[PDB]
Design a binder for this molecule. Structure first.
Ligand SMILES: CCCCCCCCCCCCCCCCCC(=O)OC[C@H](COP(=O)([O-])OC[C@H](O)COP(=O)([O-])OC[C@H](COC(=O)CCCCCCCCCCCCCCCCC)OC(=O)CCCCCCCCCCCCCCCCC)OC(=O)CCCCCCCCCCCCCCCCC
Lengths: 57, 63
């Protein structure tokens, strides 16, 4: 009683019911480095300008 | 000019210039610490973007 599968069927992506848990860290990655802190706050002007030796702005 | 005007104007000049000098010294120290540790917004040379990584299920499993 076995029907041979049609052209297209055996290459389908199927779904599988499992009773094993999902591997939570299959790559065994350690803790990620903490990122550099972003910038936050409004942009105040430069305190007394460029401060390049004598240029007051 | 009055000696009051020259005097208090000199105090204003000295405040502005001493504040600029202390900010320049802080700028040197900030640059030294950010180059040494790399944890500031400056001296952040690029690494590889991890938005290029394909996380799709590949052709072989062991990867
Ligand atoms: C109510 C709404 C309306 C309000 C309007 C109010 C104004 C009304 C009038 C409108 C026009 C305004 C014009 C600008 C304002 C005055 C600027 C000023 O005097 O700054 C003083 C400025 C600093 O003095 P201060 O007492 O500390 O500040 C007073 C103010 O607070 C100055 O303010 P500050 O401290 O915030 O200034 C910021 C900063 C202040 O400056 C600094 O922090 C110091 C560093 C400045 C640069 C130094 C460089 C040194 C090495 C290079 C030298 C080059 C050679 C010299 C020139 C050779 C001949 C071309 O500026 C700069 O760094 C800019 C660079 C210098 C340019 C100055 C403006 C020039 C405009 C006209 C140019 C015409 C040609 C003149 C010759 C070109 C060179 C000036 O003086 C100098 O640096 C010495 C040079 C003289 C300045 C230029 C004078 C402008 C008028 C020229 C008339 C004659 C022209 C003759 C024909 C052409 C030449 C042959």
């Amino acid at each position: 009683g076995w029907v041979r599968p049609d052209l297209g069927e055996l290459s389908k992506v199927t779904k599988v019911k499992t009773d094993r848990p999902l591997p939570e860290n299959p790559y065994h990655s350690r803790a990620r480095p903490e990122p550099n802190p972003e910038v936050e706050g409004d942009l105040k002007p430069a305190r007394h300008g460029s401060r390049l030796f004598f240029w007051t702005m | 000019d009055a000696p009051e005007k020259n005097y208090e104007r000199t105090m204003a000049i000295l405040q502005i210039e001493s504040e600029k000098a202390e900010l320049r010294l802080k700028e040197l120290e900030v640059r030294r610490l950010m180059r040494a540790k790399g944890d500031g917004p400056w001296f952040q040379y690029p690494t590889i973007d991890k938005a290029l990584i394909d996380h799709s299920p590949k052709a072989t499993p062991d990867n």
